[PDB]
Scaffold this active site. Structure first.
Site, PDB file in Angstrom:
ATOM      1  N   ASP A  41       6.572  66.704  57.360  1.00  0.00           N
ATOM      2  CA  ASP A  41       6.454  67.331  56.057  1.00  0.00           C
ATOM      3  C   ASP A  41       6.372  66.295  54.912  1.00  0.00           C
ATOM      4  O   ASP A  41       7.066  66.428  53.897  1.00  0.00           O
ATOM      5  CB  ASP A  41       7.602  68.351  55.866  1.00  0.00           C
ATOM      6  CG  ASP A  41       7.398  69.334  54.732  1.00  0.00           C
ATOM      7  OD1 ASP A  41       6.238  69.756  54.509  1.00  0.00           O
ATOM      8  OD2 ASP A  41       8.390  69.656  54.047  1.00  0.00           O
ATOM      9  N   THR A  97       2.959  66.359  92.621  1.00  0.00           N
ATOM     10  CA  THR A  97       1.566  66.611  93.008  1.00  0.00           C
ATOM     11  C   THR A  97       1.085  67.827  92.213  1.00  0.00           C
ATOM     12  O   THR A  97       1.789  68.846  92.177  1.00  0.00           O
ATOM     13  CB  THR A  97       1.420  66.817  94.523  1.00  0.00           C
ATOM     14  N   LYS A 111       4.975  64.834  51.647  1.00  0.00           N
ATOM     15  CA  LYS A 111       4.324  65.346  50.425  1.00  0.00           C
ATOM     16  C   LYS A 111       4.921  64.579  49.242  1.00  0.00           C
ATOM     17  O   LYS A 111       6.060  64.121  49.360  1.00  0.00           O
ATOM     18  CB  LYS A 111       4.675  66.838  50.172  1.00  0.00           C
ATOM     19  CG  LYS A 111       4.391  67.859  51.250  1.00  0.00           C
ATOM     20  CD  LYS A 111       4.974  69.222  50.890  1.00  0.00           C
ATOM     21  CE  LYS A 111       6.485  69.252  50.834  1.00  0.00           C
ATOM     22  NZ  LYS A 111       7.008  70.641  50.709  1.00  0.00           N
ATOM     23  N   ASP A 156      13.942  65.183  52.856  1.00  0.00           N
ATOM     24  CA  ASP A 156      13.574  66.484  53.467  1.00  0.00           C
ATOM     25  C   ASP A 156      13.132  66.336  54.937  1.00  0.00           C
ATOM     26  O   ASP A 156      11.948  66.451  55.264  1.00  0.00           O
ATOM     27  CB  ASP A 156      12.544  67.224  52.565  1.00  0.00           C
ATOM     28  CG  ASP A 156      12.123  68.665  52.869  1.00  0.00           C
ATOM     29  OD1 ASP A 156      11.900  68.993  54.067  1.00  0.00           O
ATOM     30  OD2 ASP A 156      11.852  69.421  51.898  1.00  0.00           O
ATOM     31  N   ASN A 159       8.690  65.310  48.501  1.00  0.00           N
ATOM     32  CA  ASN A 159       9.672  64.719  49.429  1.00  0.00           C
ATOM     33  C   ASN A 159       9.771  63.187  49.337  1.00  0.00           C
ATOM     34  O   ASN A 159      10.367  62.538  50.201  1.00  0.00           O
ATOM     35  CB  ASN A 159       9.399  65.184  50.865  1.00  0.00           C
ATOM     36  CG  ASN A 159       9.499  66.673  51.055  1.00  0.00           C
ATOM     37  OD1 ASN A 159      10.148  67.394  50.286  1.00  0.00           O
ATOM     38  ND2 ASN A 159       8.905  67.163  52.118  1.00  0.00           N
TER      39      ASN A 159
END
Ligand SMILES: CC(C)(C)NC(=O)Nc1ccc2nccnc2c1
Ligand SMILES: CC(C)(C)NC(=O)Nc1ccc2nccnc2c1
Lengths: 281, 281
Positions: free
Chosen positions: B118, B156, B120, B139, B123
């Site tokens: 997040d 396998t 941005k 944040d 933040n």
């Protein structure tokens, strides 16, 4: 060597192998099965305690000591693996009876938000040493519970990476992995041989699976009906969004068999006869 | 209305907004910031307590009552968002100083097995009301800790679904989402406008991002150097396997600036001057 914890020994009398050991509940003198796991298991217990279906294994008791001890209902028929190992094949009708139950069990799981992730003949148990019997799905260790994507899609994607937006197309189709596995299990049961292997082939196991090009031996499959093979073909579809669901498989002509459905309901009534409390008329 | 829990009140004197409120630690008479979350947060606390970097926010104390109260170091400059909102743009040198720190912070996170998810301008916090300052990433609510695929690849793949084998190609590139976000943050800081938006466009926000076709306004970008724009271009790459990592960004010619690196080391020394214990010569 080693000893069993006092708490287990207090309630059970341990016995022979089939890590799985036979044990006797002291209170009832009834046979049980004790799965020993070396010290995720707590999630598997939580999953098992919440699910209630006749084709899913029930946990009877749990012990968290030097190792994990899981008390389960004993399955006298053992593994489905033992019935299919070394080119051994089941008669079509038996494949149907067993597969129908695997479909009901897996449909119940998906309805309840659980994906098994490890469906194999080794994790399918038969209730008796008889051909017509109840089956039960076991080994929920790799199971997942049905998100971060939904929460991300609530906001504006100004800062959102393209691969995240691309993944929105496939999201919520993880359950389709269980339908692939069932597809492979059905192929093995009907033919006695695996659809994808490294035996007598130049193509890598990875390449056979991604291409969806299963090994088809006409001589083996001529003995099997075209309806059964059509269901296999619909489950062994590379695109998980196109692959048959448990509901689609259950609606398939191959499972539209009133005889097989009756034999299953009969095995249910026979199992339930011991537990049956009188009812209001 | 409502009251703060006794335990918080015992240690702090609550004050004005910037849910984030100003508070005073009673013991030190020092300003702190208290983040109130309505009753995942425990994982965020665990993540924050373990990380130790000058460009990542430090948790000072935590209270689990009617709501969650998180005591953090106060950031007098506030959000980076407030510096870029409404076509406002930072001078190239300031973008560099801030971005360099965002790169060091995100590189530290990835080295330590954490993906923020997040990133941005909202933040990213600035330490002072001055242009040249230390930044801190905040944040960690959407953050993830770095698997089920590795465990599956040990066996396998006889019963393994093709989409799982297909996903092996991309696996372990989730961290590249943080580098996309940083790419977008750098574009906003340099230009004052977002690279992908629904303002004056017919193409859907989803389509602009997946195609990687950012809105390029020559008049705005003529003021910005070709080196800065080259870094943006390398971070805003659709293929996460081709996208620049924090290490590649840090080696880019745009960040090969001995002046900017000195100004950062200076801000570090100034912050660290208060905490500095005498040392063995
Ligand atoms: C038929 C034979 C050879 C006696 N094996 C058997 O009952 N095996 C198992 C294995 C695992 C089990 N896990 C749970 C319940 N029954 C189980 C029975
Ligand atoms: C500059 C101004 C307007 C006083 N805002 C501010 O300091 N805001 C914030 C917001 C969130 C915070 N979270 C942690 C630490 N400081 C913070 C400061």
């Amino acid at each position: 060597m080693s000893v069993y914890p006092k708490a287990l020994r207090d309630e059970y009398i341990m016995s022979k192998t089939l890590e799985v050991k036979l044990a006797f509940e002291r209170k009832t003198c009834k046979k049980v099965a004790i799965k020993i796991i070396s010290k995720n298991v707590e999630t598997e217990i939580e999953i098992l305690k919440k699910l209630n279906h006749p084709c899913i294994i029930k946990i009877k008791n749990f012990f968290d000591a030097e190792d994990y001890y899981i008390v389960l209902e004993l399955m006298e028929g053992g593994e489905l693996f033992d019935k299919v190992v070394g080119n051994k094949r089941l008669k079509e009708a038996t494949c149907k009876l067993y597969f129908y139950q695997m479909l009901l069990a897996v449909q119940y799981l998906h309805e309840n938000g659980i994906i098994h992730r490890d469906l194999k003949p080794e994790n399918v148990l038969l209730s008796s040493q008889e051909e017509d019997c109840l089956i039960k799905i076991t080994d929920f260790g790799h199971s997942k519970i049905l998100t971060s994507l939904m929460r991300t899609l609530c906001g504006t994607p100004t800062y959102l990476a393209p691969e995240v937006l691309v993944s929105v197309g496939t999201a919520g189709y993880n359950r389709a992995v269980d339908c692939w596995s069932l597809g492979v299990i059905l192929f093995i049961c009907l033919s006695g041989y695996p659809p994808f292997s490294e035996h007598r082939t130049q193509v890598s196991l990875k390449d056979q699976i991604t291409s969806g090009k299963y090994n088809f031996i006409p001589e083996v499959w001529a003995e099997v009906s075209e309806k059964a093979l059509d269901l296999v073909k619909k489950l062994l579809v590379v695109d998980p969004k196109a692959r048959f669901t448990t509901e689609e498989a259950l609606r398939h002509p191959w499972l539209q068999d009133e005889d097989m459905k009756r034999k299953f309901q009969d095995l249910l009534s026979e199992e339930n006869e011991s537990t049956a409390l009188p009812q209001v008329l």
